[PDB]
Amino acid sequence: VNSFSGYLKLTDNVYIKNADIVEEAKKVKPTVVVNAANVYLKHGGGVAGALNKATNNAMQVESDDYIATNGPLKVGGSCVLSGHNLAKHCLHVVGPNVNKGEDIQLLKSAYENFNQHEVLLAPLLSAGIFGADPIHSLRVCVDTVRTNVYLAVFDKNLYDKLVSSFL
Ligand SMILES: C[C@@H]1CN(c2ncnc3[nH]c4ccccc4c23)C[C@@H](CO)O1
Numbered sequence: 001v002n003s004f005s006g007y008l009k010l011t012d013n014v015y016i017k018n019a020d021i022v023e024e025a026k027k028v029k030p031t032v033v034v035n036a037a038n039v040y041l042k043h044g045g046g047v048a049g050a051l052n053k054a055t056n057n058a059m060q061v062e063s064d065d066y067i068a069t070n071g072p073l074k075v076g077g078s079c080v081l082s083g084h085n086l087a088k089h090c091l092h093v094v095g096p097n098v099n100k101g102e103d104i105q106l107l108k109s110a111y112e113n114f115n116q117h118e119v120l121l122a123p124l125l126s127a128g129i130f131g132a133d134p135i136h137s138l139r140v141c142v143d144t145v146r147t148n149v150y151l152a153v154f155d156k157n158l159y160d161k162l163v164s165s166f167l
Contacts, residue, residue, distance in 0.1 A: 002119060002148075003028050004017075004150045005027060006019075006031075006121045007150055008056070008163060010142060010166055011142055012152065013145065013146060013147065013148050013149065014140075014141060014142050014145065014149050015148075015149070015150045015151065016150075016151045016153060016159070016162065016163065017151070017152055017153070017159075018137070018153055018154075018155075018160075019097075019153070019154070020050075020110035020142040020146075020152065020154055021033070021047060021050070021051070021121065021123055021152040021154070022050050022051060022054045022086070024057075024150075024152050025027070025051075025054075025083075025086040025087050025094060025121060026054070026056035026085075026086060027083055028121065029086070029087060029088075030083075030088070030118045030119065030120070030121040030150075031049070031082055031087065031088045031117070031118075031119060031120075032083070032087060032088045032089050032090070032091050032117045032121065033086050033087035033089075033090050033091070033122070034090075034091045034092075034093055034102065034114070034120055034121065034123065034125075035047060035048050035051050035059075035072070035090050035091070035092045035093065035095070035123035035131065035149075036048050036095065036123050036126075036127075036128070037078075037092035037093060037094050038039050038094060038097070038127065039072040039073045039074065039075060039077075040067060040069070041060075041062050041066060041067055041073070041092060041152065042060075042063075043059055043063065045126045045129060045160045046130070047081060047123045047128065049103040050055070051086065051090070052096075053132070054085070054086060055086065056083060057083040058084050059082075059084055059090065060145075062081055062084075063081065063167070066079065066081060068093075070167065071158075073092070073094050073107050073151055074109075074157070075093075075094050075095075075096055075097075075102050075103075076094060076096070076106040076107075076109030076110045077093075077094055077109075077110075077113070078091055078092055078093040078094065078110075078113035079091075079092050080092075080148070083096055084117040086157055087121070091113065091114075091117060091120065092112050092135065093110050093114075093125060094110060095107055095125035095126035095130055095132070095137075096110070096126055096130070096132070097130045097131060098126070098131030098132050099128075099130070099131040104126070104132060104136075106124050106142075107136075107137065107140050108126060109131065110125050110126070110138055111125060111140055111141055111144040111145050112144060112167060114144075114145045114146060114149055115144075115146055115147055115166060117147055118147050118148065118149045119147065119150075120147065120149050120150065121150050121152060122149055122150070122151055122152070123151070123153075124137040124138055124153065125137055125140075125151060125153060128154075131155070133163070134153075134162060135165055138162055138166065139167075
């Protein structure tokens with residue numbers, strides 16, 4: 001039993017809710033919140049900008065030190081950093097950004113990072129300002145992630161479409 005509340009069950013291991021991931025993280029304080037990161041960990045907008053703002057920019061400060069030491073992530077890759085006031089840990093995962101021309105096949109590699117964590121609160125990778133089809137992102141998630149994932153979808157219209165079209 002865990003503390004996630006109000007989710008619709010899509011599969012054995014995938015759950016979904018119309019929610020603001022920032023507000024959901026503040027309430028649940030999950031072990032892991034996933035950030036929709038880019039390779040530079042520049043958290044300017046979308047989910048990343050929202051999560052960083054909620055940490056009062058501490059996420060960005062920590063991220064800048066990470067990049068200065070380690071260099072950029074790979075598209076499809078991830079790193080574990082602090083969750084600050086939102087979670088124990090933040091798993092920064094880089095989905096392909098269609099608006100940069102990145103290969104959508106890398107979306108599966110991105111979701112594979114979730115399998116290193118037993119339970120996660122997450123957004124749909126590559127959705128929103130990353131330009132992929134969220135219906136496709138949900139399908140890849142369900143077909144790739146085997147650990148327990150609680151998906152927060154900010155847009156109610158999109159949430160209803162994701163549920164109604166789910167096979
Ligand atoms: C695939 C993404 C998912 N994004 C979200 N998902 C869940 N909670 C969220 N809170 C936010 C606050 C500000 C901006 C974005 C979000 C957001 C929306 C959109 C952004 O590119 O597309």
